[PDB]
Design a protein around this ligand. Structure first.
Ligand SMILES: O=C1Cc2ccccc2/C1=C\c1ccc2c(c1C(=O)O)OCO2
Ligand SMILES: O=C1Cc2ccccc2/C1=C\c1ccc2c(c1C(=O)O)OCO2
Ligand SMILES: O=C1Cc2ccccc2/C1=C\c1ccc2c(c1C(=O)O)OCO2
Ligand SMILES: O=C1Cc2ccccc2/C1=C\c1ccc2c(c1C(=O)O)OCO2
Lengths: 149, 149
């Protein structure tokens, strides 16, 4: 489980927000794209895996699970690509809650930037620094450092 | 020490690659932009500081040191913005070497993707995972984990 991430795609302002959550910590990275394609999802996973030791990804839907470009990036980066089926139903709920909480934060900051993408990165920052006690950013570093050592 | 990063801007294919290096580990994040502006540097620093606990940044040149947009982002994210002057000249030489090494990796992958931005993220991945013995990605997590405790 230190290597497990989940993809999640949510919509705001006619645009798509692609999120990766590190399931054990709650830590996230996110970006805005005009629409979810395999091309964009593949690039996002390549960025993530160069930054954190991503071993497994639960993909967000069957189009990205099937996408040959996503499978190419998962092969390149050494990621085991998995489906995203909430074989555990508390999964659907945790992700829904995250999207509602991210959108709330986005609305709390939205007036401080012109572009949605800036607001989304402000919300990533506030989410990862929030203590709840340790923050998600502290949790992920502690988890992965324990895994190394 | 655990919160110190250095900005570095290098050029390839008529484009600019903006790099942040975590000085104690060598770990990097990077992006391709059409040219270095305060706007893009500000956005890049907001992304970085949402993902790692960025306390101090040595800016790469005086235009980004002066930029009011850069200063806004550093204020928003809680980053101490510093000049980039190698009061220790070892610094310049280290950054030069990194740019040469990154360009070398980029050339090694360049034919595997159409777009430079993809090649640069492949190079970020190879650089962060290279063991030296620990990799930069391992060093950064160990340093920050040690700091949290
Ligand atoms: O062919 C491959 C192998 C590979 C391995 C890992 C990641 C990407 C690619 C990849 C292509 C590609 C994919 C998405 C992109 C993208 C490109 C590109 O060709 O630059 O550009 C932006 O989003
Ligand atoms: O260790 C990590 C990795 C990480 C990734 C993303 C965000 C924060 C962190 C982080 C630590 C942290 C450090 C100093 C702070 C701070 C926090 C925090 O609250 O997250 O809050 C104020 O000064
Ligand atoms: O005014 C502020 C306060 C602030 C605080 C933190 C980061 C950005 C901003 C910021 C503006 C901004 C800056 C760069 C951008 C950007 C925008 C934007 O307005 O969306 O869009 C992409 O690069
Ligand atoms: O702990 C971290 C944080 C980090 C950030 C970026 C890249 C790697 C790492 C990393 C660990 C790591 C884990 C498993 C590996 C591996 C490495 C590595 O070599 O970096 O190499 C192959 O299997």
């Amino acid at each position: 489980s230190p290597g497990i991430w989940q993809l999640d795609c949510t919509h705001l302002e006619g645009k798509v927000i692609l999120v990766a959550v590190h399931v054990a910590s709650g830590y996230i990275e996110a970006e805005v794209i005009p629409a979810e394609t395999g091309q964009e999802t593949a690039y996002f996973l390549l960025k993530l895996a160069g930054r954190w030791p991503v071993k497994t990804v639960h993909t967000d839907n069957g189009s990205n699970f099937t996408s040959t470009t996503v499978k190419a990036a998962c092969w390149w980066a050494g990621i085991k690509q998995e489906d995203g089926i909430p074989y555990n139903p508390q999964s659907q709920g945790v992700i829904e809650s995250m999207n509602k909480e991210l959108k709330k934060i986005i609305g709390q900051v939205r007036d401080q930037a012109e572009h949605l993408k800036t607001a989304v990165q402000m919300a990533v920052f506030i989410h990862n620094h929030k203590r709840k006690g340790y923050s998600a950013g502290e949790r992920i570093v502690d988890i992965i450092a324990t895994d190394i050592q």
